[PDB]
Amino acid sequence: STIQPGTGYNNGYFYSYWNDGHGGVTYTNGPGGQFSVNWSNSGDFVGGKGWQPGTKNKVINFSGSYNPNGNSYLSVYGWSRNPLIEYYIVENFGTYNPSTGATKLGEVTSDGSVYDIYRTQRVNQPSIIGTATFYQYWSVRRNHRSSGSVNTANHFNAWAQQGLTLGTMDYQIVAVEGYFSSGSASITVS
């Protein structure tokens, strides 16, 4: 069903839904690995379904509809702890490339596309452990898509070759993010 921000497990899939307290977003958990997001003149939000904990070799499948009108992205989104790392494997995005401002570390080929890889240091920013400082890694698919399979190990290995140390895995979801925009999405994860 439709929920307010929070985390939990639904039909055997972990979910996380976060927003900045601005209105304009509706997040709904559906059957199995399904979730939907509908938004209209939102603030900042990100939510979706997957695993808690994730793993360093998961092959993540997703399908469905993704129709942003403005700034948004569809990604595999997760964290590690000790060290604290935030990461995104971006499969599609709207009007803004969310890796803008991050430092390019190279490229990796996975699951039918080249990806550009990046990182940036986030300083005194919200995180799964509260206000914190941590590196944020990106892998941005050149050939955008809204269904597919992601071999996460290819991305983790590419980042590791340029200095990433992944600690203990925390959650790992397929997420829809929006940033002062409108859109819809209906995604099924497995």
From Swiss-Prot:
GO biological process terms, semicolon-separated: xylan catabolic process
Keyword Secreted: yes
Residues carrying covalently attached carbohydrate according to the record: 38, 61
Residues binding substrate, per UniProt: 73, 77, 88, 122, 126, 136, 171
Catalysed reactions listed for this entry: Endohydrolysis of (1->4)-beta-D-xylosidic linkages in xylans
Coiled-coil annotated residue ranges, if any: none
One cellular component (GO) term of this entry: extracellular region
Pathway: Glycan degradation; xylan degradation
EC class: hydrolase
pH effect summary: Optimum pH is 4.5-5.5. Stable from pH 3.0 to 8.5 at room temperature and from pH 4.0 to 7.5 at 40 degrees Celsius.
Keyword ATP-binding part of the UniProt annotation: no
GH11 domain boundaries: 2-189
GO molecular function, one term: endo-1,4-beta-xylanase activity
EC number: 3.2.1.8
Protein localization: Secreted
Alphabetically ordered keywords of this record: Carbohydrate metabolism, Glycoprotein, Glycosidase, Hydrolase, Polysaccharide degradation, Pyrrolidone carboxylic acid, Secreted, Signal, Xylan degradation
Inducing or repressing factors: Induced by D-xylose, dependent on the cellulase and xylanase regulator xyr1. Repressed by glucose through negative regulation by the crabon catabolite repressor cre1.
Active site: 86, 177
Similarity comment text for this entry: Belongs to the glycosyl hydrolase 11 (cellulase G) family.
The protein's role, per its UniProt record: Glycoside hydrolase involved in the hydrolysis of xylan, a major plant cell wall hemicellulose made up of 1,4-beta-linked D-xylopyranose residues. Catalyzes the endohydrolysis of the main-chain 1,4-beta-glycosidic bonds connecting the xylose subunits yielding various xylooligosaccharides and xylose. The catalysis proceeds by a double-displacement reaction mechanism with a putative covalent glycosyl-enzyme intermediate, with retention of the anomeric configuration. Produces xylobiose and xylose as the main degradation products.
Entry protein name: Endo-1,4-beta-xylanase 2
Chain's gene name: xyn2
Shown part of the complete sequence: 35 to 223 of 223
